[PDB]
Design a protein around this ligand. Structure first.
Ligand SMILES: Cn1nc(-c2ccccc2)cc1C(=O)N[C@H](Cc1ccc2ccccc2c1)C(=O)O
Length: 145
């Protein structure tokens, strides 16, 4: 029961799963702080983002709900192995880090928006977040170191 994990019950099936309210990750297995972490991410922006513009699109007009649908489809494809994270980040992330497969490099606490930072620090090395909302949009975060 590491930082932020609770036990839940599948609504489809009734099987126990685990949910992390800091990262928004969910998994079937029962789960499991450093000075610095390294993360990649895939950002989907929406009309209410801080800067509603990206290399992909001059004026981003999608709604926040549509952005979450896009995020959820990418998470499904990445969990299935149908696509890998780096490939979706390169194609579809509304962040300039798309050119680097979503990689942001290493950072310590005190640098990123707080929901992004908290989720980064609560992920285990190799672990991926669920949807993480910041003023910039919705993020899928992969902790790489
Ligand atoms: C930080 N950073 N690193 C890069 C980068 C790295 C490698 C190669 C090229 C670009 C781009 C950015 C950045 O600020 N990107 C922002 C989106 C962003 C990202 C990390 C966020 C992290 C937390 C909260 C909001 C964020 C919001 C943008 O492009 O609008």
């Amino acid at each position: 029961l590491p930082p932020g994990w609770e036990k839940a019950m599948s609504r489809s099936s009734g099987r126990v799963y685990y949910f992390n309210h800091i990262t928004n990750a969910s998994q079937w297995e029962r789960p499991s702080e450093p000075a610095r972490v390294r993360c990649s991410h895939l950002l989907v922006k929406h009309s209410q983002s801080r800067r509603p513009s990206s290399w992909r699109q001059e004026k981003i007009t999608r709604t926040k709900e549509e952005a979450l649908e896009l995020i959820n489809g990418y998470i499904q494809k990445i969990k299935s192995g149908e696509e890998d994270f780096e490939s979706l980040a390169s194609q579809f992330s509304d962040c300039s880090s798309a050119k680097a497969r979503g990689d942001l490099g290493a950072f310590s606490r005190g640098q990123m928006q707080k929901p992004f930072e908290d989720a980064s620090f609560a992920l285990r090395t190799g672990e991926m977040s669920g949807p993480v909302f910041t003023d910039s949009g919705i993020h899928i975060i992969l902790r790489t170191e």
